[PDB]
């Protein structure tokens, strides 16, 4: 919160197994404003990614 | 796995992407984007008792 | 003196003034008259 | 009043505001959310005229 929501760092950081957005398009994230951004970080297996 | 959870409620709080603000124009039909709120109209000084 | 009450899911009809303030309210499940007021969206029936 | 009030309905869309759909989603997704709003609006106007 209280920051500039620049998402180009996510694409620059690494290629990913999956990058699936449900509410918004993955390329519109830098145009929108977000009331509260929460990053839930965890490790799972590939067969559980779905 | 990182889940970026957020809600879009016409930005009661901002956390906005890397966009650049411009100057206000009043008493003209203009397009506008206020923390993501998008529309077209004539913006005037308000006298509503907020 | 100390008072404690508890909130529950309820529907209310909120009356606003010319200014941004609430002057009255109807609890839509309190009484058949209140339910009617909420149905009609009026404080006078 | 009823005809105007129906504009606030989502009809299954993520948002009743067309600008939010176009701002958040890319064309192939926006068309689905827009078709949901168009269908609802079509029944609202047809009911009004009938
Ligand atoms: C609504 O707010 C106004 C102030 O913004 C309250 O006061 C009145 O303001 C008008 C402004 O033109 C004056 O002409 C009135 O004389 C003011 N009232 C008094 C008693 O002096 C107004 O009272 C508020 N309304 C309510 C219902 O609280």
From Swiss-Prot, chain B:
> Quick one: where's region Disordered?
10-32
Which superkingdom, per the lineage? Answer: Viruses
Q: What result follows from mutating residue 10 to P?
A: Increased resistance to human covalescent sera neutralization
* Stated consequence of mutating residue 38 to K: In strain: Omicron/BA.1
Assembly, per entry: Binds to host ACE2. RBD also interacts with the N-linked glycan on 'Asn-90' of ACE2. Cleavage of S generates a polybasic C-terminal sequence on S1 that binds to host Neuropilin-1 (NRP1) and Neuropilin-2 (NRP2) receptors. Interacts with host integrin alpha-5/beta-1 (ITGA5:ITGB1) and with ACE2 in complex with integrin alpha-5/beta-1 (ITGA5:ITGB1). May interact via cytoplasmic c-terminus with M protein. May interact (via N-terminus) with host bilirubin and biliverdin, thereby preventing antibody binding to the SARS-CoV-2 spike NTD via an allosteric mechanism.
This chain's function reads: Attaches the virion to the cell membrane by interacting with host receptor, initiating the infection. The major receptor is host ACE2. When S2/S2' has been cleaved, binding to the receptor triggers direct fusion at the cell membrane. When S2/S2' has not been cleaved, binding to the receptor results in internalization of the virus by endocytosis using host TFRC and GRM2 and leading to fusion of the virion membrane with the host endosomal membrane. Alternatively, may use NRP1/NRP2 and integrin as entry receptors.
Name the record gives this protein: Spike protein S1
Q: Which residues of the full protein are shown?
A: 510 to 559 of 1273
Swiss-Prot record, chain D:
> Coiled-coil stretches, from where to where?
1-34
What this protein is reported to do is described as: Subunit of the fusion protein that is processed upon entry into the host cell. Mediates fusion of the virion and cellular membranes by functioning as a class I viral fusion protein. Contains a viral fusion peptide that is unmasked after S2 cleavage. This cleavage can occur at the cell membrane by host TMPRSS2 or during endocytosis by host CSTL. In either case, this triggers an extensive and irreversible conformational change that leads to fusion of the viral envelope with the cellular cytoplasmic membrane, releasing viral genomic RNA into the host cell cytoplasm.
Q: What is this protein called?
A: Spike protein S2'
Organism annotation? Severe acute respiratory syndrome coronavirus 2 (2019-nCoV)
- Species lineage, top-down? Viruses, Riboviria, Orthornavirae, Pisuviricota, Pisoniviricetes
């Amino acid at each position: 919160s209280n920051c500039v929501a620049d998402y180009s760092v996510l694409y620059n950081f690494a290629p990913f197994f999956a990058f699936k957005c449900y509410g918004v398009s993955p390329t519109k994230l830098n145009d929108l404003c977000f009331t509260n951004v929460y990053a839930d970080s965890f490790v799972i297996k590939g067969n559980e990614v779905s | 796995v990182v889940v970026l959870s957020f809600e879009l409620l016409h930005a009661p709080a901002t956390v906005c992407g890397p966009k650049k603000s411009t100057n206000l124009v009043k008493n003209k039909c203009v397009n506008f984007n206020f923390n993501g709120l998008t529309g077209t109209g004539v913006l005037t000084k308000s006298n509503k008792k907020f | 003196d100390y008072y404690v009450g508890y909130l529950q899911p309820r529907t209310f009809l909120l009356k606003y003034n010319e200014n941004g303030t609430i002057t009255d309210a109807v609890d839509c499940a309190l009484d058949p008259l209140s339910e009617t007021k909420c149905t009609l969206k009026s404080f006078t029936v | 009043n009823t005809l105007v009030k129906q504009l606030s309905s989502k009809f299954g869309a993520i948002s009743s505001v067309l600008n939010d759909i176009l701002s958040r989603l890319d064309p192939p997704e926006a068309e689905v959310q827009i078709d949901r709003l168009i269908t609802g609006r079509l029944q609202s106007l047809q009911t009004y005229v009938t």
